[PDB]
Design a protein around this ligand. Structure first.
Ligand code: AGS
Ligand code: AGS
Ligand code: MG
Ligand code: MG
Lengths: 134, 364, 406
């Protein structure tokens, strides 16, 4: 009900106060939307095959799908280069960079050949989004 | 020709050996629907040029038909009519003595064998041990979709050699689909077509026949943009919505006035427990009479019990919308069941301007 | 070279596939001695006897009779006076057909007559002939056991000598007979059991794959005998033999395994290898259910996992299509935006296909009154089987695997 809307506003304001920001930004809204949605929650998500967490897997999938869908209105190497450009704010060492390259290569391959969300079109194959992913 | 089928062919050829050699009395081959059991064995038999009789169990729904067809085809390979299995054995022994049938193995291919267990009790055991009884260098093959575990009789019989046809994969399916490319365009064009089609539909439809049928249907729309004037992006953008519309249907390929009220009343009677009926219809606080009372309550106008409403009831029963439960002779206490989907009843209520959800006890 | 390989292939195929007679007999000395002695008594004199032989299927029941007949018929001119009749429970299912076969084999249709007349006193009044009865148990299920009673009566009568031999796999053949025939049945029973140890099984395997002394090439035969002798003590071959001996002691399975092993014998490999026997044993011992599950698709796997969850939550209770559909919808809705947007008809078709493959069976079958929907279904699989099959699935997605684990 409207009470949940007021709670959402309160949560956004709390996020804004946490970051010492005089104005509220949509990032806080996106953050609070998950917390309001989750409800039933496990202790810990299991690992996914070097292992990676389910939340990070979903985050990478969402980012790559959003970028490809935005560009729709690409190439494998170009997309990897974009991702590494976007994540430069977190990597601080060469080892972390090579780890990130390994992870993104593995994730793109896994999406291409297991989850079928990414479709290959014919060393630099074209990648397209399966038209039934929202 | 056969593609991605080389292990099984080699195994069968090794099993056969030479013409004068003997083989197993019974081989039971099982696999999936699109494994190609009929294609591979028939092509192999044609290539090796062996005396073989091909039989469909479904066509021979009676024992006499089966035996007569087998005997007639075998004679044509070299009129005869038989009635009992022993007579069939004797006539088979008589007919197998031909010079062309002297030192050669005789093969009886049976397909769709799943019905054999429903024909006769002793027919399957007799067919299993045919080589012992005839003693005339005879081999019998089985093709089926059910595992051998369910074909075992209670008394137990001569165990056939069991064989499995491997399931298909992405590469095998792509190769098979790309073999029969149309001559009017490049092979790589059809390969890309097969690639995108598999990337779209492999999740659900793995049937080779079905996927090939879909490709045949959808190719003309695939080839339009280039005719209109190797542009992968252009073709994909032009073609995606049509593929989505096609995927909407993978395996699929106005009542009278009072009839609508009868149908909705029947649905209410079926899916609403009797205890709550008055709670929904009595102004103050399944058998035919309950249906009549509910109909009288729902309709705002006074409806006379003309025979035409009973004719409507019987017509609805005939149209397989309402199922009769009780005995047909008992036409004073009849029982009915409603078999209409909920979406259909909601649509008809919308066309009637009636809100059925307000009366459904389960939803409340 | 090639000709020798072809000849040995023919000989071994005849030995295994057709079960041609062989002088070698294993652990059946006393039984065969008794049976041959009694056959000689029944042939050289006018005395009558009735015997039943009980054993598991494939234990060489027919071999004893065939060897005894080939041993004793050619002794003297008694074979001229002796007549043999063979009746099988599978071919003759009715007493009329049995009477027709008896008349035709005895070549008395000219004496008796050609028409379908039910009178049989032509033979009965006229009635040394031996009878062999394969699948003796089936005759006991006839309406009145008339044929068995008449055979026992003429055996006990003082008109003509008749010897009756029966074969049975059931151990309770005595209780399937009526009191009268049981009283008139001479309680003569022979039991055929595989009463021998594992070393004797190894000796049987070594002897069975041994070339006979009548083969043309002698040095090749000696080399073959040395090769099989060497392969006898190889621990992989002994492991395979131990596995099959634990499974079943029947010689028919051993013959089948040896035939399959010999199938992989070519010119480049004239002599077998332990790896060949390992391959044959692996080929003979694979489960069909796991293969069938492996041959499925993604949607069927999801439906099966939902079915397993239903069986776990509701302990040993049936189910229908609607509950499975509802919980599949729950699974696809909890996940944010996974690509599983399917409508009702396609899932219904998948369920129909699953029922067609006979992994799911209805209870108290009826049609018309109940649709395919709202029908009580049950699963015919075990949880460990599903887990093992899912482990070997080629391209199982992560989401469905974790849902299965949950
Ligand atoms: N391995 C294969 N190589 C080439 N063509 C194949 C192969 N498998 C199947 N096909 C083709 O697919 C067609 C349909 O396969 P089927 O032979 O009907 O499959 P099936 O295993 O016989 O299943 P049933 O018994 O007919 S329901 C065949 O007529 C072939 O043209
Ligand atoms: N004691 C034995 N000595 C030699 N060979 C044996 C012995 N017992 C069984 N066998 C062999 O086992 C194989 C299978 O026996 P079968 O003849 O098929 O059984 P069976 O006698 O026909 O019994 P049923 O019930 O009629 S199938 C044959 O090749 C026999 O030679
Ligand atoms: Mg077929
Ligand atoms: Mg036998």
């Amino acid at each position: 009900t409207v009470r949940q809307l007021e709670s959402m506003i309160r949560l956004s304001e709390a996020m804004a106060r946490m970051h010492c920001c005089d104005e509220v930004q949509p990032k806080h809204v996106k953050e609070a939307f998950r917390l309001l949605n989750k409800s039933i929650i496990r202790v810990e998500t299991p690992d996914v095959n070097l292992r990676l967490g389910f939340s990070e897997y979903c985050r990478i999938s969402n980012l790559i799908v959003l970028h490809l869908r935005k560009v729709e209105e690409l190439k494998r190497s170009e997309l990897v280069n974009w991702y590494l450009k976007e994540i430069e704010s977190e990597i601080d060492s060469e080892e972390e960079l090579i780890n990130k390259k390994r992870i993104i290569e593995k994730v793109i391959h896994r999406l291409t050949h297991y989850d079928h969300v990414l479709i290959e079109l014919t060393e630099d194959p074209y990648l397209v989004v399966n038209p039934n992913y929202l | 020709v056969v593609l991605c089928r080389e292990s099984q062919v080699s195994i069968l050829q090794s099993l056969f050996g030479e013409r004068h050699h003997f083989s197993f009395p019974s081989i039971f081959i099982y696999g999936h629907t699109a494994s190609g059991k009929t294609y591979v064995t028939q092509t192999l038999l044609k290539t090796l040029e062996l005396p073989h009789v091909f039989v469909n169990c479904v066509e021979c729904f009676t024992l006499r038909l089966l035996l007569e067809q087998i005997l007639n085809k075998l004679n044509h390979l070299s009129e005869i009519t038989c009635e009992t299995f022993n007579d069939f054995v004797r006539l088979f022994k008589q007919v197998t003595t031909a010079e062309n049938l002297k030192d050669q193995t005789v093969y009886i291919v049976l397909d769709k064998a799943e019905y054999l267990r429903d024909m006769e009790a002793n027919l399957l055991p007799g067919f299993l041990r045919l080589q012992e009884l005839a003693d005339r260098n005879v081999t019998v093959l089985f093709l089926s979709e059910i595992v051998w575990e369910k074909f075992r009789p209670n008394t137990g019989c001569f165990e056939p050699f069991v064989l499995y046809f491997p399931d298909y994969s992405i590469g095998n399916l792509q190769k098979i689909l790309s073999h029969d490319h149309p001559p009017e365009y490049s092979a790589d064009f059809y390969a890309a077509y097969i690639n995108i089609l598999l990337g779209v539909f492999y999740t659900v439809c793995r049937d080779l026949k079905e996927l090939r049928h879909l490709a045949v249907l959808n190719f003309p729309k695939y080839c339009e943009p280039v005719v209109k004037g190797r542009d992968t992006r252009k073709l994909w953008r032009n073609i995606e919505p049509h593929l989505k519309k096609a995927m909407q249907t993978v395996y699929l390929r106005e009542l009278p006035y009072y009839s609508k009220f009868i149908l909705i009343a029947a649905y209410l009677a079926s899916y609403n427990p009797a205890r709550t009926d008055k709670r929904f219809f009595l102004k103050h606080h399944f058998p035919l009479d309950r249906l009549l009372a509910i109909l009288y309550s729902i309709v705002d106008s006074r409806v006379a019990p003309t025979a035409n409403i009973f004719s409507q009831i019987t017509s609805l029963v005939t149209l397989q919308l309402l199922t009769l439960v009780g005995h047909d002779d008992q036409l004073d206490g009849p029982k009915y069941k409603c078999t209409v989907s909920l979406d259909f009843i909601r649509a008809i209520a919308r066309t009637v301007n009636f809100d059925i959800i307000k009366y459904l006890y389960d939803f409340l | 070279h090639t000709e020798c390989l072809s000849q040995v292939q023919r000989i071994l195929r005849e030995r295994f596939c057709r079960q041609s007679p062989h002088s070698n007999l294993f652990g059946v000395q006393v039984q065969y001695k008794h049976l041959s002695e009694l056959l000689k008594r029944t042939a050289l004199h006018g005395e009558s006897n009735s015997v039943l032989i009980i054993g598991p299927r494939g234990s060489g029941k027919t071999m004893l009779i065939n060897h005894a007949l080939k041993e004793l018929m050619e002794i003297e001119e008694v074979s001229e006076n002796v007549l043999q009749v063979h009746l099988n429970g599978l071919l003759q299912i009715n007493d009329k057909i049995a009477l027709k076969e008896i008349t035709r084999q005895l070549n008395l249709e000219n004496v008796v007559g050609d028409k379908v007349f039910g009178s049989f006193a032509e033979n009965l009044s006229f009635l040394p002939v031996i009878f062999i009865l394969d699948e003796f148990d089936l005759f006991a299920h006839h309406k009145n056991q008339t044929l068995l009673y008449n055979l026992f009566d003429i055996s006990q009568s003082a008109q003509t000598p008749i010897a009756v031999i029966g074969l049975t796999c059931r151990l309770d053949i005595l209780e399937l007979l009526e009191k009268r025939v049981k009283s008139r049945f001479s309680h003569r029973q022979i039991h055929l059991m595989n009463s021998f140890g594992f070393p004797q099984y190894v000796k049987i395997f070594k002897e069975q794959l041994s070339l006979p002394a009548e083969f043309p090439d002698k040095v090749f035969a000696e080399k073959w005998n040395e090769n099989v002798q060497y392969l006898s003590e190889d621990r992989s071959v002994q492991e395979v033999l131990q596995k099959h001996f634990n499974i079943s002691k029947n010689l028919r399975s051993l013959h089948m395994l040896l035939m399959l092993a010999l199938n992989r014998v070519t010119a480049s490999h004239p002599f077998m290898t332990a790896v060949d026997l390992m391959e044959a044993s692996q080929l003979c011992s694979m489960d069909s259910k796991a293969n069938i599950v492996h041959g499925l698709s993604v949607l069927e796997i999801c439906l099966i996992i939902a079915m397993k969850h239903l069986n776990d939550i509701y302990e040993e209770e049936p189910f229908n299509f609607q509950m499975v559909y509802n919980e599949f919808q729950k699974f696809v809705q909890r996940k944010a935006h996974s690509v599983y947007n399917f409508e009702k008809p396609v899932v219904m078709k998948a369920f129909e296909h699953l029922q067609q493959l006979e992994l799911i069976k209805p209870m108290e079958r009826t049609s018309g009154n109940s649709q395919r929907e709202y029908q009580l279904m049950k699963l015919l699989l075990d949880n460990t089987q599903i887990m093992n099959a899912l482990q070997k699935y080629p391209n199982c997605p992560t989401d469905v695997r974790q849902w299965a684990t949950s």
